[PDB]
């Protein structure tokens, strides 16, 4: 029909509860595309998948294809303003991303629906004519330097990266991907090679049309979709690259076993056994791996984790398949150790092998095929409706992976048992495939070899023989079963019809001193599926630090005990969350409406009937205290905003508190405080899905008589509901704080503007402000001055104040990031008053398309109201009531509020700073304003006794 | 050569005996006029004292006319004829740093001042006229009624008023001792009128009739000269007339053969059950050199081993007793024996009296003990021998009234010195001590609707009943019991009195010498009194003990059956001059002990000892927690005025549990429950201490430090962290806010209010502006609000602090409805503008001297400096300097800054007003002109108006 396109894709199957409509097409040349035409969506979304990535760097400059990845959104021929894509998108509601894997660099937006051209036609030019800029090279390569920097001292990272160099040197599989400042720019230099032409060499070799899958998501009918895409990207030229293969595997005999110990920055404790297996992508249709998965990585009864755990030795475990690439996988079980654990790791791994010789002595399950089949056969049908950017940017993903007609469901649904792969696959677990890598502190000192990017400590030695054949004895082991039907399985998908009386907003539907209940039977999405949201206030879950670590090991215990039991409930899509706060505890019980009220009540009878298990009690304490403790590795950044944190409230127990009551917590303790901690309690819960108001008010009832019945529970007293306030910091007052963070060699800061009260007024005056500065703060701190990778700027709400910060992460010391922050809002002054109202409007309405998205699955509806809730606001209506009112601004009324709130003159001016200073770190442009001299803060309890606390928020009903 | 005999003077004392360590010069004698005076000479005192007591009072009224030496006694303070405005003598002293007071018992009027010692001449004219030339303006006396009916009815409702005269109105109807004293506008205005009497003319009568010089004790204290002295006294008060009025005696006891062997049953306003035991017996004035009547009391009231209150308490019948020898009047005296009641008590009253009469029954067994007389005599020598030095204003008021008593040359000694063993005298007060001359009382509830008399002038219900011959009779025949032992040698009588000498490294102030993550030791040694004393104080932080009711009320019974269970041990240490206080705090809890350092480190030892490892008794738990309840309950029957304060402090902290929250928390405080607080509480601790006294360095690191190791050894404390020691923030008001909060009293029949104008945090500033403006006022308003418009007897002005904030205050309880009061206080501040604005520098800066002696009294005893830098302590402030700064700013304000604060802070309209107002309303609910005031916020919560209002700051310390 049309020359353009070299087919038209048939029905792309779909979930019948899928209202969305699909066309699937391959262009002429080769783009595979897939179009979604939602006429609702209040944002659309593209996407875009090259096939190439990492692995297909050059040898000499390492980092490449991350690198071109940035250079693209710095301007094309054709949208040669370097800020022009990233600006169009934040005047219009939009964001992007991407992010450069092995065998893929993957790109997608979204913006606001009434703008979908504009933005893919900018999106488009990055696949056709991209500037890379010299100066503009010479600038990212410090975000890339900044990005591997904050990844340097990354234990994750650091293995990751530690993998590919212990396989063979001389496969694509151990290249350093993300580059560096050193790989970008240094080596290149001194090697005399140009950075440019090699990033127009790369773009143009291997960006090509046949390797990449588009898919676009908006309002438009499928047809005039059809037609846009065709516009904008048949253009791309198509020079029919060969999708690259790595058939030989980066592990090959002498890479066999091999035991690797190493010496992470964060003291942990963990347990790496790794196998090479062929590539099983092409099995996608059964899936041996995942089959194997499931079994090996099980948690339930008669598992293997289960027998581990209650041998003291491991605490969670998982198992399963690990991508490779075009060529070869990995089969992974991975623990982590107890102390014990760390001693045992021989026997450890013998029981691994015992549990594999099982499953070989059973041979496939076809029943457990069947049952994951199914499972899966309903999650797919009830799924949640995707937001547009992730939507895309999967299935732009996939689509190299499978035919039009199938990409939406090729990776929820299986086909056949296919035993003889299972078998296959089965048979490549074996001890003389394996490879065992130990992570403990232990090694410290002990090590002989250093891995060259991350500078990793580790020793390399060969598995004894005797060693190997003793795990190829593997006895069967009577502890070892396999799993039983899953007793969780929902069958009951009836959508209850609504009630008459059923509510937009959730309705306060019951109000006594021990409980208010909120309830919304589900009026939007109409699957069988239910959210149910407590908190349990108590004042002695937060009153010292000593009590605060005991409702920690308290809800850690309980979830322990729980695990068991409740896996079998997750896999049956029936998930819960059980979470201690500052104001007591925190449960959530998400899922299938089927069967909640049997996971419910079994959690809130072990909360109330609790009996701890000592050697449990143990190993978790000990877990809790390296917790604490690994915070000294959290980076600058992280640092900083916590101290912000602890600052501004009104209580606050820091690390170093919790740490040392901690070794106060025994057991007799533990077991009196559980039920002081439950003798009196208010709840305050959200039931919201397919619920009638009777069946909440009987879940709502069965809770308080669980907890009365076997805890006793009596009502607190309305005097004794109180939250924390948070600081009210004087007029004209700044405050610094500073810290070191003894780990990482870069520093952090954010720095707070505390405006006022939340409040319609002040609440629009703020995102306003966010709005207009959010692109140009991203633009002058990280694009144009380059002051690090991680750059923010929005609003802060805690405690129902508000403020402006920015955080950043820099090697730059932090009081320069402080003037750079300073220069750049004055130079903001200035472009807000020479802002056109023709501009100023256009963030307006970006803003309201924000705030007016519509929630597209139930738990996104049901954490929006959770959060007027939690936060005593209760103001269900706030978007529309606050996006009239952000409708009626002036661009006068936003400068008054810059002069009066924000800009270093003003009046009310309320600025405390964070300053966390690097490991190494010591204690034209447009010009930074002159600084007053900061009172420094050197106790923050003395700090906050000197200063007044804000009022509460007055609730709206 | 034999003496000038100066003709005014009858004749002039030999030595005064006092206390060697007594610095006060002393001299006494007798006017020409039979006046009986001692002249105090205190060259070092900064406030002079004079008092005048008169031998008459209430016994004497009149018969048709109840109160009206009460009644006069308001009325001289209204003008004289040499100095004729009203408020003359008010005002002369509230200029010159001083203050008055009078009171009316059944045989003495006494009038007392203290002001500045510069002007203690000027006040002692003013208050001699008092006694010569009294207007009793026929206005005045008008309005004055009033303010004897507003006393009355504040203790109209009040359960010891309503006993003490039930009492008179069960004996003899007429004798003077059935009299009702107080008087109210009935006796005082309504009945006379109807019976046509003249009451200015029955004043003048009565004040020319009694107010005799023979009847009159002075005592004057200053700084001048004892012969300076002499000449004053001598000047102002011999022209007091003599009319030679013989003394009234009353040699017939009010309680006569027919109301013997009587018993009465009372119901009470407030929750209570006490058992009243009463013996007649005759006047034991006169034997005041043996003190029978004391040894009996001694013994029958002890509380140690083998004692009377031992046993009934564990019987678990009664709490606490209290018996001696009761005053009456010139010709009768009782001997008491009183106790509250348990609820299995209040079932065996019967059985009470009968123990009691059991160890009568052992003392006559055992006879006079001449070793206790020892004992009694030794403790009194040393309690004399180290007497504190007293305030002047009360010490002439008490050495006034017992000239009356004693020879010159004795009046300092004679209340402590014993000289003579009188066995018979003991044996004879003790065989009146028998149960056909007993009067048994009972109040309780329980009676409730079962009597069937109303005593006429409180209202008390009650059912007079013979006690029964059968019952009299058991009583008779007490054999003796074996748990009643006398007492045993008190081992805590100190002997080491030797005043360490004063360290090297000493200092003005006290020094925190100890500053750990335990405990914060500030540390004085005594450098002004040098007696053989040491005041200790500890406050321990805990957060458990206010976290919530529940805890508070742990917290609460904890330290009252701790207490409970020191009690014997301690009580010999009580009488050896070495007491203690034990009471939770919102932050924890409050240890103190005084008194002579010898034996203080044993019994605080034992305090925390027995703290770290208390034990408690299952039925001592029960009977404290049901006493603990019913006091919450009786709450409900507090004056109108005192719950406008409770809500206040409710309304402007941040955490407070109401009366009724702990009430209602109450019943979930079971015994395992608090026998896991204990520990809980005990578990992380911050001591802060002040050790002040005759004490060296080491001694006081070593008490504290002994502090914290029994606290470590048997309770495993460890300390908190600083984050935790965290104190109330007051609620901040809005500017140009007014709240008002509503209650009503449902027992009182008048209401009352607080209002509050909140300024801001103190700060030198600040604390001198509202302490210069409340001296200003502070005497005007009491003459507008009560001795000009009557509003009602309480009325209050002056700063409020709290929580590092501060503010002005009045507090009034009147018939009246808040609302007016609030008007009149309004109407007031407007007047004070103009007063204020016309006022000549010279009285301004006359108020700033006022001020300025005041802050900078020194303090008397040890007791009173101790306080003064614990305030400094737990305030936080440690502004140990404080006075000599403040007084300083204080000198340099000026009327311009005063107004500039008053229109400011204060003024109806001012900018920054925030006024708080708390009304609580009566059991049944020209002038200068009020101005019109805003519609006020009315809180109907108090949890959502405090969420609503931002916290202040803590103050910075020093
Ligand atoms: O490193 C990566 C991720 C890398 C990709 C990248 C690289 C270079 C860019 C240059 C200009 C604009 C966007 C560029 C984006 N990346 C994402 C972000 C975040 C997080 O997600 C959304 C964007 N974003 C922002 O911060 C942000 C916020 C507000 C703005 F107005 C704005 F323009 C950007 N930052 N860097 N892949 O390999
Ligand atoms: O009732 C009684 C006691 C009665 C004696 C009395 C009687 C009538 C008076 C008339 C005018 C002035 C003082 C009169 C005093 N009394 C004492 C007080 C309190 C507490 O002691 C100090 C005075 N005082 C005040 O409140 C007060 C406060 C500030 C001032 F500037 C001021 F002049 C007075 N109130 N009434 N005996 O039988
Ligand atoms: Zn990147
Ligand atoms: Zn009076």
Redesign the interface.
């Known amino acids: 029909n049309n020359p353009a396109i070299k087919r038209i894709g048939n029905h792309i199957t779909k979930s019948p509860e899928d209202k969305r409509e699909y066309r699937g097409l391959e262009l002429a040349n080769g783009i595979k595309v897939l179009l979604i035409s939602d006429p609702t969506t209040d944002k659309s979304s593209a996407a875009l998948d090259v096939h190439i990535g990492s692995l297909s760097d050059p040898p000499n400059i390492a980092g490449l294809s991350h690198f071109l990845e940035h250079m693209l959104f710095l301007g094309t021929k054709k949208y040669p303003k370097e800020n022009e894509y990233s600006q169009f998108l934040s005047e219009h509601a939009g964001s992007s991303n991407a992010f450069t894997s092995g065998e893929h660099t993957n790109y997608y937006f979204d913006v606001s629906h009434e703008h979908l051209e504009g933005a893919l036609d900018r999106f488009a030019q990055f696949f056709l004519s991209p500037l890379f800029d010299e100066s503009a090279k010479d600038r990212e390569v410090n975000a890339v330097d900044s990005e591997h920097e904050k990844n340097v001292m990354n234990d994750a990272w650091r293995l990751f990266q530690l993998e590919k160099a212990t396989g063979n040197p001389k496969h694509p599989f151990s290249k350093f991907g993300t580059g560096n400042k050193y790989t970008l720019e240094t080596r290149p230099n001194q090697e005399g090679i140009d950075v440019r032409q090699e990033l127009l060499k790369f773009h143009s070799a291997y960006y090509s049309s046949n390797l990449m899958a588009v898919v676009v998501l908006g309002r438009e009918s499928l047809d005039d979709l059809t037609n846009l895409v065709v516009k904008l990207f048949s253009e791309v030229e198509n020079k029919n690259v060969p999708l690259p293969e790595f058939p030989e595997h980066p592990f090959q005999e002498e890479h066999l076993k091999q035991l690797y110990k190493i010496v992470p920055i964060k003291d942990i404790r963990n347990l790496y056994v790794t196998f090479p297996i062929p590539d099983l992508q092409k099995y996608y249709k059964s899936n041996p791996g995942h089959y194997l998965g499931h079994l090996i990585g099980h948690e339930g009864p008669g598992s293997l984790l289960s027998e581990l755990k209650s041998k003291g030795w491991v605490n969670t475990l998982v198992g399963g398949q690990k991508e490779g690439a075009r060529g070869f996988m990995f089969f992974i079980i991975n623990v982590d150790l107890t102390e014990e654990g760390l001693l045992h790791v021989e026997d450890i791994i013998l029981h691994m092998f015992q549990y594999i010789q099982k499953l070989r002595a059973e041979g496939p399950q076809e029943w457990v095929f069947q049952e994951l089949k199914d499972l899966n056969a309903v999650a797919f049908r009830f799924k949640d409706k995707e937001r547009p950017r992730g939507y895309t940017s999967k299935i732009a993903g996939i689509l190299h992976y499978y035919p039009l007609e199938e990409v939406l469901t090729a990776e929820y649904l299986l086909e056949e048992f296919r035993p003889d792969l299972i078998e296959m696959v089965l048979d490549k677990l074996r001890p003389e495939n394996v490879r065992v890598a130990i992570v403990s502190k232990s090694f410290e000192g002990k090590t002989d070899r250093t891995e060259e990017w991350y500078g990793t400590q580790y020793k390399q030695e060969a598995i004894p023989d005797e060693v190997i054949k003793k795990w190829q004895n593997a006895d069967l082991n009577g502890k070892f079963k396999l799993p039983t039907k899953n007793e969780f399985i929902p069958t009951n998908f009836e959508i209850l019809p609504l009630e008459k009386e059923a509510t937009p907003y959730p309705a306060l539907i019951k109000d006594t001193a021990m409980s208010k209940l909120w309830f919304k039977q589900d009026d939007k999405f109409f699957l069988p599926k239910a959210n149910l949201n407590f908190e349990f206030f108590s004042?002695?879950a937060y009153?010292?630090?000593?009590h605060s670590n005991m409702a920690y090991l308290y809800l850690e215990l309980l979830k322990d005990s729980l695990n068991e039991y409740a896996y079998a409930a997750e896999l049956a899509g029936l998930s819960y969350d059980l979470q201690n706060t500052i104001y007591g505890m925190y449960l959530s019980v998400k899922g299938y409406n089927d069967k909640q009220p049997i996971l419910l009540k079994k959690i809130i009878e072990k909360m109330a009937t609790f009996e701890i298990d000592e050697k449990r009690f143990e190993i978790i304490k000990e877990a809790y205290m390296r917790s604490l403790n690994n915070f000294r590795a959290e980076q600058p950044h992280q640092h900083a905003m916590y101290y912000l944190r602890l600052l501004m409230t009104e209580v606050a127990?820091?690390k170093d508190?919790l740490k040392?009551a901690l070794d106060?917590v025994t057991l007799p303790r533990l077991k009196?405080f559980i039920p002081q901690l439950l003798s009196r309690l208010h709840i305050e819960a959200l039931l919201h899905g397919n619920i009638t108001k009777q069946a909440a008010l009987g879940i709502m009832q069965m809770v308080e008589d669980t907890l009365i019945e076997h805890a006793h529970t009596?009502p607190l007293?309305?005097?004794?509901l109180?939250r924390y306030?948070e600081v009210?910091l004087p007029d004209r007052g700044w405050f610094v704080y500073q810290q070191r963070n003894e780990v990482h060699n870069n520093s952090g800061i954010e720095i707070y503007y505390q405006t006022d009260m939340q409040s319609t007024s002040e609440n629009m005056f703020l995102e306003l402000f966010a709005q207009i500065i959010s692109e140009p703060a991203f633009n002058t701190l990280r694009t144009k001055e380059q002051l690090g990778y991680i750059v923010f700027s929005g609003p802060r709400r805690a405690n129902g104040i508000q403020g402006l910060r920015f955080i950043i992460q820099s090697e730059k010391p932090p009081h320069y990031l402080e003037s750079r922050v300073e220069a750049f809002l004055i130079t903001m002054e200035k472009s807000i008053e020479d802002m056109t109202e023709e501009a100023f409007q256009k963030h307006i309405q970006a803003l309201a398309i924000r705030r007016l998205d519509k929630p597209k699955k139930l738990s996104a509806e049901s954490a929006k109201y959770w959060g007027e809730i939690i936060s005593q606001q209760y103001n269900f209506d706030r978007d529309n009531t606050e996006v009239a009112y952000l409708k009626t601004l002036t661009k006068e009324d936003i400068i008054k509020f810059y002069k009066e709130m924000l800009a270093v003159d003003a009046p009310r001016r309320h600025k405390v700073s964070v300053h966390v200073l690097a490991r190494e770190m010591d204690s034209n442009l447009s010009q930074a304003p002159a600084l007053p001299q900061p009172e420094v803060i050197q106790?923050?309890?003395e700090f906050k006794?000197?200063?007044?606390?804000?009022?509460?928020v007055?609730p709206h009903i």
């Open positions: 004042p002695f009153v010292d630090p000593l127990w820091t508190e040392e106060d009196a009596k007293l309305p005097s004794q109180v306030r009210q106790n923050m309890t006794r000197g200063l007044p606390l804000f009022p509460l007055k």
